[PDB]
Amino acid sequence: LGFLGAAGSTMGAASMTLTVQARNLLHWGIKQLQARVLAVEHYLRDQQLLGIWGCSGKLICCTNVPWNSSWSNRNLSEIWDNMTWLQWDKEISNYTQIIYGLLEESQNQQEKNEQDLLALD
Amino acid sequence: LGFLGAAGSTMGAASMTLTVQARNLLHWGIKQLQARVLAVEHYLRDQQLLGIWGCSGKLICCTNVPWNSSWSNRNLSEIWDNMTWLQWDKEISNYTQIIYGLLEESQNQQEKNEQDLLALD
Amino acid sequence: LGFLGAAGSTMGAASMTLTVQARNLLHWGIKQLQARVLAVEHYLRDQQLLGIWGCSGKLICCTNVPWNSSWSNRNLSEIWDNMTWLQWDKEISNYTQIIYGLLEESQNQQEKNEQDLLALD
Amino acid sequence: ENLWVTVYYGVPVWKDAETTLFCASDAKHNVWATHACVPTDPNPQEIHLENVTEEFNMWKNNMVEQMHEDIISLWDQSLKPCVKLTPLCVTLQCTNVTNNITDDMRGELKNCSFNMTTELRDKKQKVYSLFYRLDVVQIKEYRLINCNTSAITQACPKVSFEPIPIHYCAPAGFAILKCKDKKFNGTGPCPSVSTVQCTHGIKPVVSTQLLLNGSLAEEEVIIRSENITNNAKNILVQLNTPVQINCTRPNNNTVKSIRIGPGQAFYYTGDIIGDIRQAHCNVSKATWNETLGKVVKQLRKHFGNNTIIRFAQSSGGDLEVTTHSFNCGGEFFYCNTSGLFNSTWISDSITLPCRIKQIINMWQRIGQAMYAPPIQGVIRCVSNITGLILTRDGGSTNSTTETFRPGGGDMRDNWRSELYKYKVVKIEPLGVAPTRCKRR
Amino acid sequence: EYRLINCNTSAITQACPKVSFEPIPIHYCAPAGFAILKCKDKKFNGTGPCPS
Ligand SMILES: *[C@@H]1O[C@H](CO)[C@@H](O[C@@H]2O[C@H](CO)[C@@H](O)[C@H](O)[C@H]2NC(C)=O)[C@H](O)[C@H]1NC(C)=O
Ligand SMILES: *[C@@H]1O[C@H](CO)[C@@H](O[C@@H]2O[C@H](CO)[C@@H](O)[C@H](O)[C@H]2NC(C)=O)[C@H](O)[C@H]1NC(C)=O
Ligand SMILES: *[C@@H]1O[C@H](CO)[C@@H](O[C@@H]2O[C@H](CO)[C@@H](O)[C@H](O)[C@H]2NC(C)=O)[C@H](O)[C@H]1NC(C)=O
Ligand SMILES: *[C@@H]1O[C@H](CO)[C@@H](O[C@@H]2O[C@H](CO)[C@@H](O)[C@H](O)[C@H]2NC(C)=O)[C@H](O)[C@H]1NC(C)=O
Ligand SMILES: *[C@@H]1O[C@H](CO)[C@@H](O[C@@H]2O[C@H](CO)[C@@H](O)[C@H](O)[C@H]2NC(C)=O)[C@H](O)[C@H]1NC(C)=O
Ligand SMILES: *[C@@H]1O[C@H](CO)[C@@H](O[C@@H]2O[C@H](CO)[C@@H](O)[C@H](O)[C@H]2NC(C)=O)[C@H](O)[C@H]1NC(C)=O
Ligand SMILES: *[C@@H]1O[C@H](CO)[C@@H](O[C@@H]2O[C@H](CO)[C@@H](O)[C@H](O)[C@H]2NC(C)=O)[C@H](O)[C@H]1NC(C)=O
Ligand SMILES: *[C@@H]1O[C@H](CO)[C@@H](O)[C@H](O)[C@H]1NC(C)=O
Ligand SMILES: *[C@@H]1O[C@H](CO)[C@@H](O)[C@H](O)[C@H]1NC(C)=O
Ligand SMILES: *[C@@H]1O[C@H](CO)[C@@H](O)[C@H](O)[C@H]1NC(C)=O
Ligand SMILES: *[C@@H]1O[C@H](CO)[C@@H](O)[C@H](O)[C@H]1NC(C)=O
Ligand SMILES: *[C@@H]1O[C@H](CO)[C@@H](O)[C@H](O)[C@H]1NC(C)=O
Ligand SMILES: *[C@@H]1O[C@H](CO)[C@@H](O)[C@H](O)[C@H]1NC(C)=O
Ligand SMILES: *[C@@H]1O[C@H](CO)[C@@H](O)[C@H](O)[C@H]1NC(C)=O
Ligand SMILES: *[C@@H]1O[C@H](CO)[C@@H](O)[C@H](O)[C@H]1NC(C)=O
Ligand SMILES: *[C@@H]1O[C@H](CO)[C@@H](O)[C@H](O)[C@H]1NC(C)=O
Ligand SMILES: *[C@@H]1O[C@H](CO)[C@@H](O)[C@H](O)[C@H]1NC(C)=O
Ligand SMILES: *[C@@H]1O[C@H](CO)[C@@H](O)[C@H](O)[C@H]1NC(C)=O
Ligand SMILES: *[C@@H]1O[C@H](CO)[C@@H](O)[C@H](O)[C@H]1NC(C)=O
Ligand SMILES: *[C@@H]1O[C@H](CO)[C@@H](O)[C@H](O)[C@H]1NC(C)=O
Ligand SMILES: *[C@@H]1O[C@H](CO)[C@@H](O)[C@H](O)[C@H]1NC(C)=O
Ligand SMILES: *[C@@H]1O[C@H](CO)[C@@H](O)[C@H](O)[C@H]1NC(C)=O
Ligand SMILES: *[C@@H]1O[C@H](CO)[C@@H](O)[C@H](O)[C@H]1NC(C)=O
Ligand SMILES: *[C@@H]1O[C@H](CO)[C@@H](O)[C@H](O)[C@H]1NC(C)=O
Ligand SMILES: *[C@@H]1O[C@H](CO)[C@@H](O)[C@H](O)[C@H]1NC(C)=O
Ligand SMILES: *[C@@H]1O[C@H](CO)[C@@H](O)[C@H](O)[C@H]1NC(C)=O
Ligand SMILES: *[C@@H]1O[C@H](CO)[C@@H](O)[C@H](O)[C@H]1NC(C)=O
Ligand SMILES: *[C@@H]1O[C@H](CO)[C@@H](O)[C@H](O)[C@H]1NC(C)=O
Ligand SMILES: *[C@@H]1O[C@H](CO)[C@@H](O)[C@H](O)[C@H]1NC(C)=O
Ligand SMILES: *[C@@H]1O[C@H](CO)[C@@H](O)[C@H](O)[C@H]1NC(C)=O
Prior knowledge:
This is part of a larger assembly, with three copies of chain A and two copies of chain D.
Chain A: H1 11-14, H2 18-23, H3 28-53, H4 76-82, H5 85-91, H6 96-120
Chain D: E1 4-9, E2 14-16, E3 22-25, E4 38-39, E5 46-49, E6 55-57, H1 63-77, E7 94-96, E8 109-117, E9 124-132, E10 136-138, E11 142-144, E12 153-154, E13 167-169, E14 174-179, E15 187-189, E16 193-196, E17 210-212, E18 222-225, E19 235-249, E20 253-260, E21 264-272, E22 280-284, H2 285-303, E23 308-311, H3 319-322, E24 324-328, E25 331-335, E26 343-345, E27 349-356, E28 359-360, E29 370-371, E30 379-392, E31 401-406, H4 412-419, E32 422-427, E33 430-433
Parallel strand pairs in D: 3-4, 12-29, 23-31
Antiparallel strand pairs in D: 1-33, 2-32, 3-13, 5-16, 6-15, 7-8, 8-9, 10-11, 14-16, 14-32, 17-30, 18-19, 19-22, 19-30, 20-21, 22-27, 23-26, 24-25, 25-27, 28-29, 30-31
Bound molecules: a molecule of 2 linked components (NAG-NAG) (7 copies) and 2-acetamido-2-deoxy-beta-D-glucopyranose (NAG) (23 copies).
Region (Fusion peptide) (chains A, B, C): 1-13
Region (Immunosuppression) (chains A, B, C): 31-49
Coiled coil (chains A, B, C): 90-121
């Protein structure tokens, strides 16, 4: 189970290696600087997105957005055992923009307001 | 609803857009790199202030530091419903370093010890 | 107790200053840019490591991984009151990689699984 | 009551700031930015900010300085691969040209010859070419202008000088504010403010005494200066209507070239085909007459009632500031603007003579010089005036009259006419507030 | 009479006598966030799916 050794594995099996994958995410002088700056800017963008979702403290988290069955006509056991993450990512690639927008609107925007009201009272 | 569209809104109304604003915060080759490196450093420094305060998990948080209302003689409705954030920033421009110092020292130092004492037993 | 003034004190006393230390952790154009970029990558890697451990929100945290008695033949109160951090770091320098691996492997891998089951219910 | 400190992130507050801006362009070789920059956003966004009165001050705008340094460095890069003319500083014996010529001031065009080197170190050749009087100084024996002051570099003939628009875009964490208010004088609070990711494209058009190919005022002629009461200051006038400029060179000049050394070649003016005639530029009389009347009316508002306003040609200084510089086809022209400013105001066309110079120094730098290659054939160039640069001869309190003369000599003042609209600010997302709340 | 070839076209620079032209093996490595995949197949014509 080296880096990306999980790539051919079922989506469920792959969950065992998430930590390992995370560890590997982080004029000649100009070439070095452009590559390094981009690696950092990219890294931070992913972390900011999790921070909006409130999931930044975890590799795995749950959300309050319900699944739209039209995104994929499959059973839970079907997805977790009969597919790889590579196949899955392609299958729902049309809806990733929608899901990200829903996570912010349905959870982040709603929860911060309700918690503020409780704090205010 | 777009970036800085909240500038004319009241401080209370403006709070709806905080997430939107957050998303947009993140020879010639040298000049371009200096701008990008500094943009990253500035971003990280603000995150460090929140991390010390313990507020880094949220866009909005409460603290244990009392307002000390003599800093400005205004009512909450006079501030939140009748004024912009742009105007507010000027009203407390001479107290900002004081408030930040209070948060780092008067709150975090007490909280870390009480949490450790509970952990010890 | 200025920057690194704590270094002369015993390990227990040094804990008072952790915030002070935290504040200071963050042709010719190439030298300037490379120095800044490397400082940032190092900073971010330490935060990533804490995130794996689940301690990213705190200066001080506890884990459920047991201490190996072979790592150091000393009393707990002896270490805190009779040593400096500079001395302590040398005595366990052979075991640092082992401890870091245990925190990642032996505890956080289990908690993510239990949380998934609780969230599922 | 029991108010507490709270913290907010993402707060919509900005502060004045200066930062490097990223150049971009909508745009085979050209001296301009297209080689040094990236493609623009095809659909720029703009957000109006309601109830915002943000202050602008064009005279302190750092964007002007940033553009200047980028333009100078950009221009210099185009000459780095190009041919050096150091071997050409010679005795250069010359004689008067005799032909079917209507001429100019006598001696304006000369027939010169010199001993020049060849591809081989062992051999020399005798050559001849035409030169303009402006490029030749008497020692009969002559020297090329600046042979005793600087090296001369030949511009590469393949490279176009035609202006290409330049856009500037903010880096993350920064934003560019734009003043939309009509009839803004460049200073004070702007009643209507909006935010843009990038600026409108600005063409690097170089001219003196008149502003060419720029933006027009939306409704009426706008007069602005750093200090309206200080006669030393340049006054920029933006027109609300265009006035065209039609320039031509009728002579049908030809171009010949000779290889010099193993790595270089030199281009020079050959025999002129047909009659030799004076280069010139037209200015419409009727259009200009109306244009001046509008400017005078606005000047009276700034300088008071019943003041007689006159215009005149510059009293002195170098050719760069006493004449109107053009770049058409890569040829550099200097024209006498007298007759445009020859008027007094109380209550079909003009033809201006022009001269051509092949040795120029666009940025007025000591120790630098460039030789333009000659352009073959007849040149026609059509462009327009979008503003004027004026100075006062006044400051006197002893008269009921006032006189204006053309200003110029500082390229930064031309860019101000397009950049006065913009300001750069930094976004500061962190802030605090009193609202009552509790926490564990 | 003769001319060195291309005196009519370009300047000529003498190679420095102390500089060898002997090849040195070069390895290329990925930046962080990237990885290089290697095809292990045999009789591969450089295109299409690689089975390993
Ligand atoms: C070309 O011809 C003109 C006209 O004859 C020459 O200009 C004259 O120069 C002389 C001698 O100094 C003066 O006395 C005249 O007043 C000039 N005539 C003008 C200005 O109309 C000119 O010098 C000749 N050029 C050469 C190189 O011989
Ligand atoms: C380069 O040569 C020109 C021409 O000789 C010099 O300009 C002259 O300067 C003297 C000083 O006595 C004057 O009397 C002349 O009127 C000038 N001639 C012209 C045609 O303007 C120039 O000074 C020399 N070098 C520099 C740096 O100026
Ligand atoms: C643009 O117009 C404004 C007024 O709309 C000018 O503001 C002046 O500021 C001075 C400051 O001492 C005041 O004394 C003046 O009373 C203000 N206006 C007037 C009409 O007096 C501003 O200076 C103008 N900018 C320029 C460059 O002229
Ligand atoms: C201006 O000069 C050019 C040549 O430099 C003339 O172009 C020539 O036109 C004749 C027409 O019969 C052709 O045969 C030649 O081959 C052309 N020469 C070229 C293309 O180099 C042009 O006609 C002249 N313009 C005039 C006389 O008005
Ligand atoms: C600018 O205006 C002048 C004056 O009308 C034009 O001069 C005439 O040009 C034509 C050829 O285009 C000649 O046949 C006339 O004899 C000229 N009139 C004169 C010399 O009095 C001139 O051509 C105009 N320039 C342009 C580019 O249109
Ligand atoms: C533009 O041309 C005018 C002439 O049309 C030049 O001015 C003349 O200067 C002489 C000497 O001072 C005066 O006697 C004339 O009265 C002026 N104009 C006349 C008489 O019409 C003017 O200097 C030229 N401008 C440039 C920059 O060369
Ligand atoms: C001002 O803009 C006009 C329009 O682009 C320029 O006229 C063009 O010039 C180019 C380059 O010579 C020609 O290819 C175009 O055909 C011209 N357009 C016409 C004649 O309609 C004019 O040259 C510009 N002025 C300056 C000083 O650059
Ligand atoms: C490949 O498939 C086999 C079953 O055919 C499975 O046992 C093995 O774990 C899979 N390999 C990976 C990397 O998923
Ligand atoms: C699922 O997606 C479709 C298409 O956007 C939408 O019409 C439907 O309302 C969605 N269902 C949600 C909660 O069910
Ligand atoms: C998914 O559930 C349906 C229920 O009818 C079943 O018919 C189908 O075979 C299931 N798919 C898989 C892959 O088990
Ligand atoms: C996903 O998007 C691609 C690109 O538009 C499209 O070809 C594919 O059919 C889509 N998949 C769907 C709609 O299931
Ligand atoms: C308000 O705060 C200031 C310090 O900023 C303090 O000096 C003053 O006494 C305070 N007023 C109180 C606590 O009533
Ligand atoms: C603030 O307004 C409330 C009513 O909303 C009023 O009861 C209170 O006295 C005000 N506080 C002041 C004026 O300090
Ligand atoms: C809002 O503030 C303005 C001054 O900016 C004041 O004139 C007005 O009375 C305030 N409105 C209230 C308190 O309702
Ligand atoms: C804050 O300082 C400024 C000068 O920098 C002063 O004009 C203003 O009155 C001060 N505010 C308070 C509340 O003292
Ligand atoms: C503690 O250290 C000993 C070696 O001194 C090792 O054999 C034992 O497995 C360790 N216990 C752990 C790592 O839990
Ligand atoms: C640890 O404490 C014991 C008594 O519990 C004592 O005998 C021993 O010397 C101590 N070890 C030290 C100080 O290293
Ligand atoms: C730490 O313990 C040693 C034991 O020899 C003692 O000599 C030393 O003085 C102690 N340091 C203290 C008490 O600060
Ligand atoms: C740590 O390793 C070094 C290697 O030289 C060794 O000398 C030292 O005794 C080791 N420390 C312990 C406590 O084993
Ligand atoms: C000023 O703010 C108010 C907030 O309700 C907004 O309705 C208004 O449109 C803004 N400006 C103008 C000119 O209306
Ligand atoms: C001048 O015109 C005449 C008559 O057309 C022509 O013969 C002559 O060649 C032209 N110029 C010269 C220098 O001969
Ligand atoms: C070129 O050199 C020769 C020999 O000195 C001389 O006769 C001739 O006049 C020179 N040509 C020029 C244009 O000076
Ligand atoms: C313009 O210059 C005059 C000279 O007396 C000065 O008095 C005035 O303050 C200046 N106006 C400005 C700087 O706006
Ligand atoms: C150029 O000629 C046009 C007519 O073709 C005329 O309308 C315009 O005024 C001229 N521009 C000048 C003289 O600057
Ligand atoms: C320059 O003088 C030479 C003398 O031989 C003549 O051949 C040539 O045609 C002249 N050039 C011009 C443009 O008159
Ligand atoms: C400009 O036109 C007006 C009539 O509209 C005329 O009176 C005036 O004399 C003309 N030009 C000048 C310089 O007066
Ligand atoms: C002169 O003053 C009158 C009012 O008395 C005004 O109508 C006119 O426009 C003024 N003229 C100017 C400012 O040129
Ligand atoms: C310029 O104005 C003066 C004074 O009215 C006049 O004598 C002169 O002829 C004018 N020049 C031209 C070219 O009209
Ligand atoms: C002025 O010249 C510019 C050159 O680009 C042209 O785009 C503009 O339409 C002209 N203005 C006129 C003819 O009114
Ligand atoms: C240089 O000489 C070579 C000899 O083969 C010839 O082929 C070539 O055209 C020449 N180059 C030039 C630029 O005349």
